[PDB]
Amino acid sequence: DDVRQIAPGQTGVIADYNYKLPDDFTGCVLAWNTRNIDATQTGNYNYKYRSLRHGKLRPFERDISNVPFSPDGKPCTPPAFNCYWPLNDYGFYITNG
Amino acid sequence: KCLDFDDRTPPANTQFLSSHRGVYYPDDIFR
Amino acid sequence: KLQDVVNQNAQALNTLVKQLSSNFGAISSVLNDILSRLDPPEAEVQIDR
Amino acid sequence: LTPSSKRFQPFQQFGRDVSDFTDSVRDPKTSEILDISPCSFGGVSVITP
Amino acid sequence: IRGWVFGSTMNNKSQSVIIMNNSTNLVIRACNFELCDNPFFVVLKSNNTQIPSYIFNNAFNCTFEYVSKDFNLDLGEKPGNFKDLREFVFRNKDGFLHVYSGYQPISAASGLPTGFNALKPIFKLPLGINITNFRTLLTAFPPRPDY
Amino acid sequence: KRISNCVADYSVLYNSTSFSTFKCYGVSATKLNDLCFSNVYADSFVVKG
Amino acid sequence: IGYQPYRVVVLSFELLNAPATVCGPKLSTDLIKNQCVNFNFNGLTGTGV
Ligand SMILES: *[C@@H]1O[C@H](CO)[C@@H](O[C@@H]2O[C@H](CO)[C@@H](O[C@@H]3O[C@H](CO)[C@@H](O)[C@H](O)[C@@H]3O)[C@H](O)[C@H]2NC(C)=O)[C@H](O)[C@H]1NC(C)=O
Ligand SMILES: *[C@@H]1O[C@H](CO)[C@@H](O[C@@H]2O[C@H](CO)[C@@H](O)[C@H](O)[C@H]2NC(C)=O)[C@H](O)[C@H]1NC(C)=O
Ligand SMILES: *[C@@H]1O[C@H](CO)[C@@H](O[C@@H]2O[C@H](CO)[C@@H](O)[C@H](O)[C@H]2NC(C)=O)[C@H](O)[C@H]1NC(C)=O
Numbered sequence A: 001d002d003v004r005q006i007a008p009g010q011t012g013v014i015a016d017y018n019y020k021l022p023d024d025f026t027g028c029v030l031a032w033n034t035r036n037i038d039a040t041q042t043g044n045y046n047y048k049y050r051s052l053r054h055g056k057l058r059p060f061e062r063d064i065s066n067v068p069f070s071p072d073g074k075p076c077t078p079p080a081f082n083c084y085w086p087l088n089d090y091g092f093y094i095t096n097g
Numbered sequence B: 001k002c003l004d005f006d007d008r009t010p011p012a013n014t015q016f017l018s019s020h021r022g023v024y025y026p027d028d029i030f031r
Numbered sequence C: 001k002l003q004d005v006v007n008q009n010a011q012a013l014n015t016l017v018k019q020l021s022s023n024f025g026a027i028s029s030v031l032n033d034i035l036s037r038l039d040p041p042e043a044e045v046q047i048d049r
Numbered sequence D: 001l002t003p004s005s006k007r008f009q010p011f012q013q014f015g016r017d018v019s020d021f022t023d024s025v026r027d028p029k030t031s032e033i034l035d036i037s038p039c040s041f042g043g044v045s046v047i048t049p
Numbered sequence E: 001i002r003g004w005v006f007g008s009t010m011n012n013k014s015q016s017v018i019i020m021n022n023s024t025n026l027v028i029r030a031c032n033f034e035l036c037d038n039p040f041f042v043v044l045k046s047n048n049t050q051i052p053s054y055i056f057n058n059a060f061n062c063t064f065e066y067v068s069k070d071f072n073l074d075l076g077e078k079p080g081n082f083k084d085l086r087e088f089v090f091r092n093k094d095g096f097l098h099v100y101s102g103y104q105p106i107s108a109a110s111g112l113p114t115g116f117n118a119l120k121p122i123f124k125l126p127l128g129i130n131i132t133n134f135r136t137l138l139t140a141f142p143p144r145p146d147y
Numbered sequence F: 001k002r003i004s005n006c007v008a009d010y011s012v013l014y015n016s017t018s019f020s021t022f023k024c025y026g027v028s029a030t031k032l033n034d035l036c037f038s039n040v041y042a043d044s045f046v047v048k049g
Numbered sequence G: 001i002g003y004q005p006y007r008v009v010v011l012s013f014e015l016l017n018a019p020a021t022v023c024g025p026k027l028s029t030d031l032i033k034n035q036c037v038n039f040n041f042n043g044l045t046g047t048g049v
C-alpha cells in the first residue's frame, strides 16, 4: 500500500518521513513483489519505517536516527507518558493481503 | 583524544564586505 | 478632437486593468488562489497560461 | 560537423549560442570539439512570367 | 585550514560529513561521528611534521566514503603576509552537496581582498543529510607539550 | 455526513489505517495541511475491488 | 482481490471562496497592519499591506 507514495508530489507516512522525490524528478521508479523472499510464516519484522517526525523530510534526504519522540518536542524517555519510538516494524507474513 | 584549548579569546565576529566574490559556473554548458 | 484623444488613452489603460480578471484556459485568474492550492508542477501549467 | 577551435573544460560536453541552439559538442571517442551548423543557408527566389 | 564538518546536531545523534584534507590525501567521510568539541590537526612548528590527531572519537552506521589520490602538502610555518586565497561555495540541494572551488594569489596583510573570481564545480556529493550547522577544522602548532 | 469545526490533521491516520487508493482532485495533497476547507462532507460506502 | 470488499470514503469541499470551519494544523500569529507582510488567511496566501 506504500508503493503509490514513491512518486513526486505525494503525501503519506513514507513520503513525509521516509523518502521523498523532487517535484522536478528525472528518472524511473521500479517496484516488484517479494512475498516469497521477504515474508515468513512466523512473520518478518526486520524491515522498519519512521512513523513519527517533527518536520517533513526534504527531497532525497535521509534520517537514520533513533531518538525518542515527544509531540511537545522536549527530550523524553520511552517509559514516560507521551514518549514513543519513531520507528515501526513492518509485519510481513505469508498470509497477508 | 578530544583535547581542549584553554584561555581562548572570543572571536568578536569582525565584519567585511563581499566585494564581487562568490560567482560560480551555473551549469555545464560552454558559452 | 482633443477630448477624443484623452478618452482613448484612458480607455486603453482601463481595458488593460479589466483584462487581469481574464482566465486564459486556466482554473482562475487569481494568482494567489492557484498558488495556495497546487504544487509548483501543477501550478506551473496554470501560471503559464 | 566541422572542427572547432573552442576549448572545453573537462566538465563540459555541449555548447550553445545565444539562440540556445547546440552548436558545439565534444566527440566521445576522440575528445575533439566539433562545430554543428545548419544544412540550410540559401536565399532563393523564383522568376516566372 | 584543513576542511569542514557539516551536520544538524554535530554529535552521534545524526549523520555528519567531514571533508578534511589530511597531509596525504583528501578524505570525504559521511558517517555518524562522535565529534570532539575542539577538533584540530597538530603539526610541530620546529619539526614541520604532522603527527596523528583526533577529529572524532567513534564512527558507525556510516554511509559515504571517498579518498582522493596521494599528494604532498607543506606543513611548515611561513613568514610574511597571506599568500593564498582559496574560495569555496557550499550548497545543499536535493540530497547533493555542491562544492565549487577557486584559487587566487594575493598579498593582502589583512581583510578580504576585493576582486572577482569564478569558482568551478569540483564536487557533487550524494550525502542526503540534513545540514544546518558547520565547523571549520584548523591545524594547531603547539611549541610545548600540554600547551 | 457533514464535518465542521475541526482540525484536519491526517497524520493521526498514520499507524492506524492504510489506504490502497488516495487521490485528490482540484487540490494538491501536499497542500492539504496549509488550507481551510468549507462545506466538507464525507460519503461512505462499500464496493468490491 | 478483485472480489474483495473495499471501504470507500469520498471527501468533498470548497476552497478559498466561502467561510471555513475545518482547517489544517497551523499556528496563527498576531495581526500586523500597515506593513508589507506575507499573509495566510484561511489558506489564502499572498503578499501585501
Ligand atoms: C589520511 O587519510 C587516509 C584515508 O583514511 C589515510 O590512508 C589510509 O591509511 C590507512 C592506514 O595506513 C590504510 O589502511 C591500511 O591499508 C593497508 C592495505 O592497503 C593494510 O595493509 C594496513 O593494515 C591498513 O589497513 C588505508 O588503506 C589508507 N587508505 C587510502 C586508500 O589512502 C592516510 O594514511 C592518512 N594520512 C595521514 C595519517 O596523514
Ligand atoms: C534539520 O534539522 C533541524 C534540527 O533538528 C530541524 O529543525 C527542526 O524542525 C522541526 C520541524 O520544523 C521543529 O519542530 C524543531 O523544533 C526544529 N529543531 C531545531 C532545533 O531547529 C530541521 O527541520 C531539519 N530539516 C530537515 C528537513 O530535515
Ligand atoms: C575509443 O575507441 C575508438 C575506436 O577504437 C578509438 O578511436 C580510434 O583510436 C585509435 C587509437 O588512438 C586510432 O588509431 C583510430 O584512428 C581511432 N579511430 C577513430 C574512430 O577515430 C578512440 O580513440 C577510443 N577512445 C578512447 C577513450 O580510448
Ligand SMILES: *[C@@H]1O[C@H](CO)[C@@H](O[C@@H]2O[C@H](CO)[C@@H](O)[C@H](O)[C@H]2NC(C)=O)[C@H](O)[C@H]1NC(C)=O
Binding pocket: E011, E012, E034, E058, E059, E060
Ligand atoms: C555518542 O556520544 C556520547 C556523548 O559523547 C557518548 O557518551 C559518552 O561515552 C563515553 C565512552 O563510554 C563516556 O566516557 C562519556 O562519559 C559519555 N558521555 C556522555 C555524555 O554520556 C556515547 O558513548 C557515544 N556513542 C557511540 C556509540 O559513539
Ligand SMILES: *[C@@H]1O[C@H](CO)[C@@H](O)[C@H](O)[C@H]1NC(C)=O
Binding pocket: E044, E047, E049, E050
Ligand atoms: C619529528 O618528526 C619525525 C617524523 O615524524 C619523528 O620521527 C620525530 O620523532 C619528530 N621529532 C620531534 C621533535 O618530535
Ligand SMILES: *[C@@H]1O[C@H](CO)[C@@H](O)[C@H](O)[C@H]1NC(C)=O
Binding pocket: A064, A065, A066, E060, E061
Ligand atoms: C545503527 O542503526 C541501527 C538501527 O537504527 C541501530 O540498531 C544501531 O544501534 C545503530 N548503531 C549503533 C552501533 O548505535
Ligand SMILES: *[C@@H]1O[C@H](CO)[C@@H](O)[C@H](O)[C@H]1NC(C)=O
Binding pocket: F015, F016
Ligand atoms: C499507533 O499509534 C498509537 C498512538 O496514536 C499507539 O497507541 C499504537 O500503539 C500504535 N500502533 C498500533 C495501533 O498498532
Ligand SMILES: *[C@@H]1O[C@H](CO)[C@@H](O)[C@H](O)[C@H]1NC(C)=O
Binding pocket: F016, F017
Ligand atoms: C479501529 O478500532 C479498533 C478497536 O479499537 C482498533 O483495533 C483498530 O486499529 C482501529 N483502526 C483504526 C482505523 O484506527
